[PDB]
Design an enzyme around this catalytic site. Structure first.
Site, PDB file in Angstrom:
ATOM      1  N   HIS C  43       0.681  -1.248  -0.039  1.00  0.00           N
ATOM      2  CA  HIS C  43       0.210  -0.090  -0.021  1.00  0.00           C
ATOM      3  C   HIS C  43       0.841   1.184  -0.020  1.00  0.00           C
ATOM      4  CE1 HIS C  43       0.261   0.272   4.721  1.00  0.00           C
ATOM      5  NE2 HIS C  43       0.292   1.427   4.220  1.00  0.00           N
ATOM      6  N   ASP C  99      -0.343  -7.568   2.244  1.00  0.00           N
ATOM      7  CA  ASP C  99       0.208  -6.045   1.773  1.00  0.00           C
ATOM      8  C   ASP C  99       1.719  -6.313   2.161  1.00  0.00           C
ATOM      9  OD1 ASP C  99       0.316  -3.236   1.707  1.00  0.00           O
ATOM     10  OD2 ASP C  99      -0.245  -2.858   3.641  1.00  0.00           O
ATOM     11  N   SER C 197       4.484   2.689   8.069  1.00  0.00           N
ATOM     12  CA  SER C 197       3.843   1.478   7.097  1.00  0.00           C
ATOM     13  C   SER C 197       5.140   0.930   6.324  1.00  0.00           C
ATOM     14  CB  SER C 197       2.723   1.675   6.347  1.00  0.00           C
ATOM     15  OG  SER C 197       1.800   2.006   6.906  1.00  0.00           O
TER      16      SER C 197
HETATM   17  C1  LIG Z   1      -8.013  -1.018   2.477  1.00  0.00           C
HETATM   18  O1  LIG Z   1      -7.937  -1.463   3.882  1.00  0.00           O
HETATM   19  C2  LIG Z   1      -7.710  -0.384   4.703  1.00  0.00           C
HETATM   20  C3  LIG Z   1      -7.539   0.841   4.087  1.00  0.00           C
HETATM   21  C4  LIG Z   1      -7.368   2.098   4.842  1.00  0.00           C
HETATM   22  C5  LIG Z   1      -7.333   3.310   4.181  1.00  0.00           C
HETATM   23  C6  LIG Z   1      -7.563   1.734   6.197  1.00  0.00           C
HETATM   24  S1  LIG Z   1      -7.217   3.216   7.180  1.00  0.00           S
HETATM   25  O2  LIG Z   1      -8.327   3.168   8.166  1.00  0.00           O
HETATM   26  O3  LIG Z   1      -6.905   4.365   6.479  1.00  0.00           O
HETATM   27  N1  LIG Z   1      -5.976   3.227   8.229  1.00  0.00           N
HETATM   28  C7  LIG Z   1      -4.705   2.754   7.789  1.00  0.00           C
HETATM   29  C8  LIG Z   1      -3.955   3.858   7.591  1.00  0.00           C
HETATM   30  O4  LIG Z   1      -4.096   4.717   8.981  1.00  0.00           O
HETATM   31  C9  LIG Z   1      -2.380   3.274   7.474  1.00  0.00           C
HETATM   32  C10 LIG Z   1      -2.108   2.343   6.731  1.00  0.00           C
HETATM   33  C11 LIG Z   1      -2.417   2.702   5.335  1.00  0.00           C
HETATM   34  C12 LIG Z   1      -2.261   3.942   4.923  1.00  0.00           C
HETATM   35  C13 LIG Z   1      -2.439   4.505   3.435  1.00  0.00           C
HETATM   36  C14 LIG Z   1      -3.215   3.494   2.599  1.00  0.00           C
HETATM   37  C15 LIG Z   1      -3.543   2.184   3.223  1.00  0.00           C
HETATM   38  C16 LIG Z   1      -3.268   1.819   4.503  1.00  0.00           C
HETATM   39  N2  LIG Z   1      -2.164   2.748   9.093  1.00  0.00           N
HETATM   40  C17 LIG Z   1      -0.748   2.960   9.541  1.00  0.00           C
HETATM   41  C18 LIG Z   1      -0.552   2.102  10.696  1.00  0.00           C
HETATM   42  C19 LIG Z   1      -1.204   3.044  11.980  1.00  0.00           C
HETATM   43  C20 LIG Z   1      -0.931   2.311  13.021  1.00  0.00           C
HETATM   44  C21 LIG Z   1      -0.540   1.196  13.365  1.00  0.00           C
HETATM   45  C22 LIG Z   1      -0.072   0.341  12.263  1.00  0.00           C
HETATM   46 CL1  LIG Z   1       0.451  -1.258  12.293  1.00  0.00          CL
HETATM   47  C23 LIG Z   1       0.161   1.117  11.015  1.00  0.00           C
HETATM   48  C24 LIG Z   1      -7.910   0.598   7.006  1.00  0.00           C
HETATM   49  C25 LIG Z   1      -8.062   0.536   8.145  1.00  0.00           C
HETATM   50  C26 LIG Z   1      -7.796  -0.623   6.007  1.00  0.00           C
HETATM   51  C27 LIG Z   1      -8.274  -1.848   6.521  1.00  0.00           C
END
Ligand SMILES: COc1cc(C)c(S(=O)(=O)NC[C@@H](O)[C@H](Cc2ccccc2)NCc2cccc(Cl)c2)c(C)c1C
Ligand code: NA
EC number: 3.4.21.5
Lengths: 10, 29, 251
Positions: C43, C99, C197
Site C-alpha cells: 500500500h 500487504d 508503514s
Molecule cells: C484497504 O484497507 C484499509 C484501508 C485503509 C485506508 C484503512 S485506514 O483506516 O485508513 N487506516 C490505515 C492507515 O491509517 C495506515 C495504513 C495505510 C495507509 C494508506 C493506505 C492504506 C493503509 N495505518 C498505519 C498504521 C498505523 C498504526 C498502526 C499500524 Cl501497524 C499501521 C484501513 C484500516 C484498511 C483496513
C-alpha cells in the site's frame, strides 16, 4: 522539510 | 537466507546488547 | 511510532526509508533483506482509492539512516529502483490482505556498521516465535501521535491473541495478518503510526541470536488507541511469493 540530497540521486 | 543476516555489526557482531532487546527475550516464555 | 523511544545507532541496520523524489518526502519504511532487495508494504506503492500508484522512477530508498530529515553524509546510502513487484493478490479493495511488495535496487548497496540485512524466518522460527505474549520490535520515522521525530523511533510490542485482534475491529482479518500492541489493562502503550508503514516487525531468535523480520507494518485504525491494535503483514506466510520473485528476477 528534508535536507536536500545530492543531485546525482535525482 | 543470507549467511550473516540479522547479526548487527554494532551489537551482535561485537557482543554488545541494545537497551531493550532483553524485554523481547524475557517475553519468550 | 507512538510512545516509542529514540533508536540507538546501528540498532536497526536493515531499516530503509522509502523516499519520494519530487516533492522530497518520506513515504514509508521498508527493510533490507539482501544487497539488492528491499521489502515493504504494497500500500506504500499502490493504493488506488487515494490515487497512489508509484513507478520505479518516482522513488528512492535511503538505507543506513538514523535522522529523519538530515542527509547523513558518509553513513546513509541512497539507491534507485530497478523494478517494483507487488503481490498479485494484494487486496487494496477490502482489507490490505497480502500487504507486501519487493523492490529490486539498480545496484547492490554496500554493507557497513549502519547497513545490514535482516533474516527472513523459516517455518520453524515462525512456529516458535509467533505466539501471543511474545514481543517483537517496530521501528520507523512515522508520526509520534495520531508531531514528527528527529530520529528513528523504536517500540517493542507483544503479539496479541487472534480472537482479540478480530474483536477489536470491524475489518475482516485474514491469516496473512497478525496484530500487536498492549491491552488497555496492561499499563504500557505504543504503536506504529502514519509514515511507519512498510517498516519491519522483527524478533530476536533466542536460538541463534539473529533478528528475523516476522511482520511488515500494514495498518491500524488511529494510532495507539485503547482497545485497538496495529496490524502486520505475516511475512512467513508470504515467503513462497518472496522466494519466487527473487529466484526468478534476482541475478
Ligand atoms: C484497504 O484497507 C484499509 C484501508 C485503509 C485506508 C484503512 S485506514 O483506516 O485508513 N487506516 C490505515 C492507515 O491509517 C495506515 C495504513 C495505510 C495507509 C494508506 C493506505 C492504506 C493503509 N495505518 C498505519 C498504521 C498505523 C498504526 C498502526 C499500524 Cl501497524 C499501521 C484501513 C484500516 C484498511 C483496513
Ligand atoms: Na493501538
Amino acid at each position: 522539510d528534508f535536507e536536500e540530497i545530492p543531485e546525482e540521486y535525482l | 537466507g543470507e549467511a550473516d543476516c540479522g547479526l548487527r555489526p554494532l551489537f551482535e557482531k561485537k557482543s554488545l546488547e541494545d537497551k531493550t532487546e532483553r524485554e523481547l527475550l524475557e517475553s519468550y516464555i | 511510532i507512538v510512545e516509542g523511544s529514540d533508536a540507538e545507532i546501528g540498532m536497526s541496520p536493515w531499516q530503509v526509508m522509502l523516499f519520494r523524489k519530487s516533492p522530497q518526502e518520506l513515504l514509508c519504511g521498508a527493510s533490507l533483506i539482501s544487497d539488492r532487495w528491499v521489502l515493504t508494504a504494497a500500500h506504500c506503492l499502490l493504493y488506488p482509492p487515494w490515487d497512489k500508484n508509484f513507478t520505479e522512477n518516482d522513488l528512492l530508498v535511503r538505507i543506513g539512516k538514523h535522522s529523519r530529515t538530515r542527509y547523513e553524509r558518509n553513513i546513509e546510502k541512497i539507491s534507485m529502483l530497478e523494478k517494483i513487484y507487488i503481490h498479485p493478490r494484494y487486496n487494496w479493495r477490502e482489507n490490505l490482505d497480502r500487504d507486501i511488495a519487493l523492490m529490486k535496487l539498480k545496484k547492490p548497496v554496500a554493507f557497513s556498521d549502519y547497513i545490514h540485512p535482516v533474516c527472513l524466518p523459516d517455518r520453524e522460527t515462525a512456529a516458535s516465535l509467533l505466539q501471543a505474549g511474545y514481543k517483537g520490535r517496530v521501528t520507523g520515522w512515522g508520526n509520534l501521535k495520531e508531531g514528527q521525530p528527529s530520529v528513528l523511533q523504536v517500540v517493542n510490542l507483544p503479539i496479541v491473541e487472534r480472537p482479540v485482534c478480530k474483536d477489536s475491529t470491524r475489518i475482516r482479518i485474514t491469516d496473512n495478518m497478525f496484530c500487536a500492541g498492549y491491552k488497555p489493562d496492561e499499563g504500557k502503550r505504543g504503536d506504529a503510526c502514519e509514515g511507519d508503514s512498510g517498516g519491519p516487525f522483527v524478533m530476536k531468535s533466542p536460538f541463534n541470536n539473529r533478528w528475523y523480520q516476522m511482520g511488515i507494518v500494514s495498518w491500524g485504525e488511529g494510532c495507539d488507541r485503547d482497545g485497538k491494535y496495529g496490524f502486520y503483514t505475516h511475512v512467513f506466510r508470504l515467503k513462497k511469493w518472496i522466494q519466487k520473485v527473487i529466484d526468478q528476477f534476482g541475478e
